[PDB]
Amino acid sequence: VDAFVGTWKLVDSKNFDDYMKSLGVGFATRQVGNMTKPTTIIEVNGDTVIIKTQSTFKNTEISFKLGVEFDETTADDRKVKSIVTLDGGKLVHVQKWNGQETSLVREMVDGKLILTLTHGTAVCTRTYEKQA
Template sequence: MSELNGTWILESKENFEEFLKALGVGVILRKIAKNITPTLIIKGEGRKWSVKMTSSFKNLEYNFNLDEEFDDVTIDGRKVKCIFKLEGKKLITEQRDFKSKELISKIEKYVDEKGHMIEFLYAKNIISKRTFKRVN
């Protein structure tokens, strides 16, 4: 079992709107995303994982096997190829352009020494950091 398993609520964020802008997310969706406090529910054992995000705006759920690429549509309607990997204790998500396979974004999640889940989000030359606290 991963120490990422559990329910997490957003505590703080840095540079998040800039990250969304680098992805090409429109101004209205960026403003909405900037002002919500999502909850993440992560369940992982072996190769089978799920990541569920709930918020006052929209809910998302991914059920996946590690290291298996799948087709996805982002909240703002872009078609991407997505893959989740476990590297040490970090859950890595990569989104690639559906046609060119060029890397669009990379997200790393891990639990730090204080018990917070740290999420680094990368797009182009932008890095965003979000910190979550465990709910349960």
């Protein structure tokens, strides 16, 4: 947990396009929404954490409890049952809807929070760099 705490800046990412051009989390919108996520606030809370997708066009935020599943709708997932936990030092967000699921596994080693976004077909590396 002792990493996530703070405000991050997106640095490296690719393949959002493909991934949405299949998942249906844009199929168009993500052609800009691929890039347009410069900041992400990650406020750890007591037993919990809240993500704040601070960007220009489109913002989202949701609270999640490491060790629970919650049914919730981010604009860029739709309604999905997110199960979150922390294995070793890896924040595994598995994201279970129905016909498929996806995985949003987060870790910081070195100085970058690497988020591996993996679905039933398609992958994206999404990397975040602590700005504050």
